[PDB]
Design an enzyme around this catalytic site. Structure first.
Site, mmCIF file in Angstrom:
data_model
loop_
_atom_site.group_PDB
_atom_site.id
_atom_site.type_symbol
_atom_site.label_atom_id
_atom_site.label_comp_id
_atom_site.label_asym_id
_atom_site.label_seq_id
_atom_site.Cartn_x
_atom_site.Cartn_y
_atom_site.Cartn_z
ATOM 1 C CE1 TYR B 511 -4.043 1.444 -0.392
ATOM 2 C CE2 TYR B 511 -3.549 2.758 1.568
ATOM 3 C CZ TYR B 511 -4.348 2.506 0.457
ATOM 4 O OH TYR B 511 -5.439 3.316 0.186
ATOM 5 C CB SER B 594 -6.093 1.735 -4.737
ATOM 6 O OG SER B 594 -6.205 3.122 -4.899
ATOM 7 C CG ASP B 672 -11.869 2.237 -10.040
ATOM 8 O OD1 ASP B 672 -11.969 3.342 -9.454
ATOM 9 O OD2 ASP B 672 -11.196 1.273 -9.601
HETATM 10 C C1 1AD Z 1 -6.413 4.011 -3.904
HETATM 11 N N1 1AD Z 1 -6.539 3.677 -2.623
HETATM 12 C C2 1AD Z 1 -6.442 5.485 -4.334
HETATM 13 C C3 1AD Z 1 -5.040 5.746 -4.894
HETATM 14 C C4 1AD Z 1 -4.672 7.149 -4.422
HETATM 15 C C5 1AD Z 1 -5.418 7.311 -3.086
HETATM 16 C C6 1AD Z 1 -4.650 6.738 -1.966
HETATM 17 C C7 1AD Z 1 -4.077 6.304 -1.019
HETATM 18 C C8 1AD Z 1 -3.389 5.827 0.166
HETATM 19 N N2 1AD Z 1 -6.636 6.485 -3.259
HETATM 20 C C9 1AD Z 1 -7.843 6.596 -2.540
HETATM 21 O O1 1AD Z 1 -8.827 5.873 -2.736
HETATM 22 C C10 1AD Z 1 -8.015 7.687 -1.434
HETATM 23 N N3 1AD Z 1 -9.406 8.108 -1.535
HETATM 24 C C11 1AD Z 1 -7.636 7.303 0.013
HETATM 25 C C12 1AD Z 1 -8.049 8.271 1.114
HETATM 26 C C13 1AD Z 1 -7.528 7.554 2.356
HETATM 27 C C14 1AD Z 1 -7.613 6.054 2.012
HETATM 28 C C15 1AD Z 1 -8.176 6.002 0.589
#
Ligand code: 1AD
Lengths: 730, 730
Positions: B511, B594, B672
């Site tokens: 992550y 992500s 998405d």
């Molecule tokens: C995937 N999780 C995307 C990629 C960039 C951002 C990040 C991270 C860490 N993201 C999100 O969905 C955001 N909205 C975050 C906000 C806090 C956890 C998810």
């Protein structure tokens, strides 16, 4: 001792030559040589420079193409070619004055022209820009705007909308100059009620927000575009600010409901031929219209109506065949099905005759592929009659006054090397050039029509031959198997030292769409060549029911129910191949593109157990997703009142379960405007819901052809590895 | 002797229980038992039925959720839940009258409500429908419309637009009832200049033409939505047809350019707290506003301004922390970074004080995770102080009058089983319930706040324990490695009889986004469990730079330059794991979702040679594609005047070449709305142009979570096979 590598294929290592000439008259032709257009004299190799290495360079390296006015006085130089759809594209143009020896720079032609063309006579130009038609009586003179209703995605003047370009005309152009150039006929399309399809385009990674392309595209059953035919008097242009084009209205028997404009064909300069089709391509009408000099109107009397029909399926192979009128347009020859369901040539008289409109000039359990030329005494055509080979192509000749005087002109020539000919006769059939696409390396020769004396050899791939000497090329068997008492041809690409005793893995190459033909006698160097020459894989194709040029019995066999017989027969043929002994039943695969991907998928999902893996590229998953003109021709309307049931029955997703017993590779282009991706997206979702694992692959911004350079290489390499993994090779 | 199968995971064979209660008062709580809401008395297990197996059944099986009015007189019954985005969704509602014992049927609530909520006091309801706010002083009474500017994708009243819901509030709701319910504050958003993103939705195979979903979504640097804050007097509703809400305008130091509404917090019923942030989250202002009874206006004097800043990066962990006011709103406690860059608790006075606005009540090289409750004499919080474990969570308690009187309340309890606690205190902290998420199976207990006496055990997973007895569960090491003289924690899921001498294949779980934490002491049963227990694969995570709760030095380390240190450190940690001996260097992989998929991709494309294969699910490929609020917080603006260079430098496609040395699996959801697919489409194209073969997989109509049931199973099975193929297993 070297094999034919995938690299050889992808890098086009072994180039295959040809001789694409352009008959400029009844005795001279143009030919591009070392980027120099040379004028050649048929008879004596007598040559001569026409346009030089020069010229073309001014417009740098973007000179996409060239078009010489029929009176050879000017040359159209195309550059800045920007593709769009199968045949459509926009370019920039320049007219070069051969005589004055320089580029006309006055009344230039708009920098975004969608289509342009010379008249059949002098140096008259007609071009479409911003969906409107323009005319320039002469290159130096200003453009005369013919239409102004032109509007993007709505009104098309002189060019075809999406479906017409793809399914009806197979060309972007919807203009037709009359002989002598007095008139200019054109079609107009209104895409108003037609629904839109919208896909994303990502472009360079620099584009922050992806584009959205929308296209009025009619899916099976949807509202279609509408048509209108006009003919405008090109002569009066200098005396008006606006000329008023006269409109021809389709015949009454076609106007009651949805219909299409089938084909346009100028007979003389006071007579034009138009073919119309009903949305249900059951019925067709070919009207002959005459120009009334008095009331300055065109008349299409029902006395010259001419009706074509089909109680077995649809009209023609993909649409009614084109008419070929005599010099005085009193009669015309046209390919149509005879009493036995065989496409042959028969005579017609301008005025229709009560249930005797035709007189077949050809008989036989074979078909006439096409009418190549019609002299005042001869009719040159091409058929698959010779040696009873539907997969072969030969040039014939019948004397009008004597239908017994029918002679084949290519059958003897090179029975070993050539069995698939393409032709090209001079302006008045004085000479002709033959294109041997036949079994062996392609061979181009030209002959004097009189006695058929082969004046000379234009191109024999000796160069290629020398190279293929140091390479282990596979062979190609072209035979037939017999099912239910009927011949069904097939072909096989056998790896080099193919030993009939050993057992090789089998790859079925599919298409199998209505009136298709995958088994023929034409020479090719494709991915199948690599597969046999280096992977030792036997690649075979089989033309089953609903196929080729073997009569309507076989072709119409699939009417109103695609995803049936053509699929089964493909499986049947594989069984038969296995019975032939040399196939390792434990490693049999099947692949296909477009229609071919559909069948691949329909076969893999048949649970027949006969195939291990398969690859479907841009497949169709259910006919409601495909366009109207194509689908409905074979499937009718997707309504409960018609064929809705067969539509819903022939779905690929309806067979998701059976995919558990197979390794499946689904590939689809992201910007596929033909087969919408929606199709594969729908398939993958069905398999995911069925808990069936499989492999997928999308190609960002790729066409229906996934033919961009890098994509092309990538998709074949990926498929190669898929087979290697599947066949335990690699 | 049985292992933990992928089927165990996908079919949720081994269920993990918990005790989610709802404090209805300072001594009673609600709890769902056998689909019966029971009222329990903290102290004596004394229970009692509140709502029966019954009720819920009227609305059949679609009863999505329930909400009890604070005065326990009515119950909101949610049904017809239709998701949309991370937290948004629309439902249908019914108010059940506990007293009269039946469903209120008069002034029903609109069948497509976007959000609804009780007041904090009685039975007042405020709900958003068609983007407008409505109020019902009492369930039986009619709705009073508060706004009418409401319009889809343009004007949001009481609910958040896309980016606010995702990046700022992490909730759909933008309403805030005041205590005693006189006022109702709400935010309004104008998405006008915000650009749109549009993706296709295919739906059931029956839909002939795919839908197009458009969403005003601001990508890095794009025009953002704008805000406005209003407070309306809910009492006067019965005497007008229309009430006029008063508006609060953001502080001057925030109005000069783009800004956001950070957080809302009612202090008392005449005082409200609002936090504002500049588009460049460098600066933050928390204004305290007072209600003027005379001029019936709210005042936010700059004397009560309070400024928060950061010279190292941004404000707060993901945004300024929330304030916690004393009973008389004279002071408030808020988590902020101390001189050493450690998030701790400090006191503030309503009126700001020149460079002394705070008084830290906590010190240490550890951080306060969150403030759980504030009594008149106690402040309950949660930190990762104990045993110096940043990955652990314990409940603490400080006496306001004596900051020395600081006692841990969960540290002793079960040091073996529990090291990660979650808490939940009653309305006035008389009792509290602990959620042991700790190392061992989760354990729920409740205690009386006074002496901490554990009144009883609410849930110990004995049931689960009995089952996990007959299964070979993997273990979880949670330790730290030291780089450049700093502790950097990590965790490992070691397969069953893990022998430190043998060599296992390694899977890095990633992550690594700013302020993330993959290494902690929480018990889980995921895909990593299956991977270790059955595939004998060691799954390890590593919290490197720009991570967790270890001070701003470590977290801000990544400021203005993502796709840097967090990526490297991930590779470094893998090296260190290899040096630990028991890792088969010839079989090391890395995967992520992500942000995690971004790093996976950035690592695979690093050409470090350390990894064999990797899987990236819905990865980010370049920051200009992601939204503004998130990206800019860490990257600034993608302009040459700011950080454009770092933006263009941290691209995944810019590393396509290095992918030749790796097996890559790219997975992305088709619908998405968070990470746009455009991102992966851009990656695949880059690799195709680089001639790099790889594997792809799209999921038709799937979310950012690809969490639909069939998709969920399919995507994990597909990834499992990918690893098996990659690790020469299977
Ligand atoms: C995937 N999780 C995307 C990629 C960039 C951002 C990040 C991270 C860490 N993201 C999100 O969905 C955001 N909205 C975050 C906000 C806090 C956890 C998810």
């Amino acid at each position: 001792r070297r094999t034919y590598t995938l690299a050889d294929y992808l890098k086009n290592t072994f180039r295959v030559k040809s001789y694409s000439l352009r008959w400029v008259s009844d005795s001279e032709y143009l030919y591009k040589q070392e980027n120099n257009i040379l004028l050649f004299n048929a008879e004596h190799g007598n040559s001569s420079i026409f346009l030089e290495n020069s010229t073309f360079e001014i417009f740098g390296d973007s000179i996409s193409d060239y078009s010489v006015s029929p009176d050879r006085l000017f040359v159209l130089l195309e550059y800045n070619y920007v593709k769009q759809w199968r045949h459509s594209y926009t370019a920039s143009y320049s007219i070069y004055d051969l005589n004055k020896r320089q580029l006309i720079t006055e009344e230039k032609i708009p920098n975004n022209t969608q289509w342009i063309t010379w008249s059949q006579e002098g140096h008259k130009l007609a071009y479409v820009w911003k969906n409107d038609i323009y005319v320039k009586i002469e290159p130096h003179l200003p453009s005369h705007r013919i239409t102004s209703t032109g509007k993007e995605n709505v009104i098309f003047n002189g060019i075809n909308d999406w479906v017409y370009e793809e399914e009806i005309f197979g060309a972007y152009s919807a203009l037709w100059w009359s002989p002598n150039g007095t008139f200019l006929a054109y079609a107009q399309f209104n895409d108003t009620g037609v629904p839109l399809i919208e896909y994303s385009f990502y472009s360079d990674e620099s584009l922050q927000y992806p584009k959205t392309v929308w296209i009025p595209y009619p899916k099976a059953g949807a509202v279609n575009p509408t048509v209108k035919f006009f003919i405008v008097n090109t002569d009066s242009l200098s005396s008006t600010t606006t000329t008023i084009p006269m409109q021809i209205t389709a015949p009454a028997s076609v106007t009651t409901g949805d219909h299409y404009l089938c084909d346009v064909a100028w007979v003389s300069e006071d007579r034009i031929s138009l073919q119309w089709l009903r949305r249900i391509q059951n019925y067709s009408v070919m009207a002959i219209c005459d120009y009334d000099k008095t009331t300055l109107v065109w008349n299409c009397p029902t006395t010259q109506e001419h009706i074509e029909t089909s109680a077995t399926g649809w009209c023609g192979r993909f649409r009614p065949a084109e008419p070929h009128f005599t010099s005085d347009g009193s009669s015309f020859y046209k390919i149509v099905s005879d009493k036995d369901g065989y496409k042959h040539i028969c005579q017609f008289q301008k005025d229709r005759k009560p249930e005797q409109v035709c007189t077949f000039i050809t008989k036989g359990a074979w078909e006439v592929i096409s009418i190549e030329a019609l002299t005042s005494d001869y009719l040159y055509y091409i058929s698959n009659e010779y040696k009873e080979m539907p997969g072969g192509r030969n040039l014939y000749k019948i004397q009008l006054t004597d239908h017994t005087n029918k002679k084949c002109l290519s059958c003897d020539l090179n029975p070993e090397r050539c069995q698939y000919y393409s032709v090209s006769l001079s302006k008045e059939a004085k000479y002709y050039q033959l294109g041997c696409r036949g079994p062996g390396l392609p061979l181009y020769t030209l002959h004097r029509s009189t006695d058929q004396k082969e004046l000379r050899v234009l191109e024999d791939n000796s160069a290629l031959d020398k190279m293929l000497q140091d390479v282990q090329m596979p062979s190609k068997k072209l035979d037939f198997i017999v099912l239910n008492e009927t011949r069904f041809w097939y072909q096989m690409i056998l790896p080099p030292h193919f030993d009939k005793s050993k057992k090789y893995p089998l790859l079925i190459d599919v298409y199998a769409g209505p009136c298709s033909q995958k088994a023929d006698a034409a020479f090719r160097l494709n991915w199948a060549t690599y597969l046999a020459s280096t992977e030792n894989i036997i690649v075979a194709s089989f033309d089953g029911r609903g196929s080729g040029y073997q009569g309507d019995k076989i072709m119409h066999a699939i009417n109103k129910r695609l995803g049936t017989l053509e699929v089964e027969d493909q499986i049947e043929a594989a069984r038969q191949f296995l019975k032939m002994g040399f196939v390792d039943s434990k490693r049999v695969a099947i692949w296909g593109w477009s229609y071919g991907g559909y069948v691949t998928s329909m076969v893999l999902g048949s649970g027949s157990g006969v195939f291990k893996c398969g690859i479907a590229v841009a497949p169709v998953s259910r006919w409601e997703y495909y366009d109207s003109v194509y689908t409905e021709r074979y499937m009718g309307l997707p309504t409960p009142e018609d064929n809705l049931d067969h539509y819903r029955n022939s779905t690929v997703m309806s067979r998701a379960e059976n995919f558990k017993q197979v390794e499946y590779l689904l590939i689809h282009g992201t910007a596929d405007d033909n087969v919408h991706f929606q199709q594969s997206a729908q398939i993958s979702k069905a398999l995911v819901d069925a808990g069936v694992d499989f492999q997928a692959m999308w190609y960002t911004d790729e066409d229906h052809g996934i033919a961009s350079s890098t994509a092309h290489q990538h998709i074949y390499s990926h498929m190669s590895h898929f087979l290697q993994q599947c066949f335990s090779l690699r």
